[PDB]
Design a protein around this ligand. Structure first.
Ligand SMILES: C[C@H](CS)C(=O)N1CCC[C@@H]1C(=O)O
Ligand SMILES: [Zn+2]
Length: 224
C-alpha cells in the first residue's frame, strides 16, 4: 500500500509512509484518544494515515508530535490541525520551523519536485523541555543535535520501543542539516540513559530493528 499501519507491541504501531522518500512514523492508541508521532509528508499523506487510524479506533486523534521541523515530520500539520488535533513540539523545533520552513520546503522540492509548496503550519503546544503524553506512556526527549539541531526521540516504556526519528536508520542518508561532530555525542548521551529498549523504529529504511541500530548508525556517522 501507499501507507501501512502495523502493530509493533500493544497500543504501539509503526507507520510506513511510502510516499516520496519512504519515511516511518508511529501511532499510539490510547484509552482516551490517539497520539500520532511524526505528521508525515503532506496533508494528503496525513489524511491517508487518518483513514487507516479510523479502521483501528474510533477514539479522537488528540495530538501529533513534530519530532523535528522537517517536511517529513511536519508536512501533515495542516491536516492534523483541520481535524482538531494539537500539534506538539519542543520550543527549539517550533523556533527552527518558523525561521527555516521555507528553506526545508525548497530543499525537499529540489529532490522531489512533485512535493507541494506547503505553507507554514506551526506547532501550537510547545514544550520548554522533555514531555510526556498518554499518562506518561509516550515520552519525548531531547539528547542533543544530530540529523538536525532539534530532533527528538520518543520512548514507549511499557513496550520498550524507541522511535528513532530521522536520527536512527540503516543508511547514512541526508547530512545537509546535520551536526556531524555532535551526532555521535548525542547517540552516546542517548545510550547513557540506559533505557530498556527491545525495539528501535528507524525513521527511514526498514523500520523494525533492535537496540543495535543505535551503534550501527553511530559507526556510520563517525566514518562520514
Ligand atoms: C527528500 C530528502 C532526501 S535528502 C529527505 O529525505 N528529507 C528532506 C527533509 C526530510 C528528509 C530527511 O532529511 O530526513
Ligand atoms: Zn527524515
Amino acid at each position: 500500500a501507499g501507507m501501512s499501519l502495523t502493530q509493533v507491541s500493544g497500543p504501539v504501531y509503526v507507520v510506513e509512509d511510502n510516499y516520496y522518500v519512504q519515511e516511518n512514523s508511529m501511532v499510539y492508541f490510547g484509552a482516551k484518544g490517539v497520539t500520532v508521532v511524526g505528521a508525515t509528508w503532506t496533508p494528503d499523506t496525513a489524511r491517508e494515515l487518518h483513514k487507516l487510524i479510523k479502521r483501528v479506533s474510533r477514539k479522537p486523534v488528540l495530538e501529533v508530535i513534530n519530532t523535528n521541523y522537517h517536511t517529513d515530520r511536519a508536512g501533515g500539520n495542516a491536516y492534523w490541525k483541520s481535524i482538531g488535533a494539537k500539534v506538539v513540539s519542543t520550543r527549539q523545533t517550533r523556533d527552527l520551523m518558523k525561521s527555516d520552513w521555507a528553506e526545508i520546503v525548497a530543499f525537499t522540492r529540489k529532490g522531489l519536485p512533485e512535493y507541494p509548496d506547503l505553507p507554514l503550519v506551526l506547532p501550537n503546544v510547545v514544550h520548554d523541555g522533555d514531555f510526556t503524553l498518554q499518562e506518561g506512556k509516550v515520552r519525548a526527549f531531547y539528547a542533543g543535535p544530530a540529523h538536525t539541531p532539534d530532533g527528538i526521540f520518543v520512548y514507549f516504556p511499557d513496550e520498550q520501543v524507541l522511535y528513532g526519528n530521522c536520527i536512527l536508520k540503516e543508511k547514512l542518508g541526508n547530512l545537509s542539516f546535520a551536526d556531524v561532530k555532535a551526532y555521535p555525542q548525542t547517540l552516546e548521551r542517548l545510550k547513557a540513559m540506559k533505557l530498556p529498549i527491545k525495539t528501535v523504529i528507524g525513521g527511514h529504511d526498514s523500520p523494525l530493528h533492535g537496540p543495535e541500530l543505535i551503534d550501527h548508525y553511530e559507526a556510520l556517522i563517525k566514518a562520514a
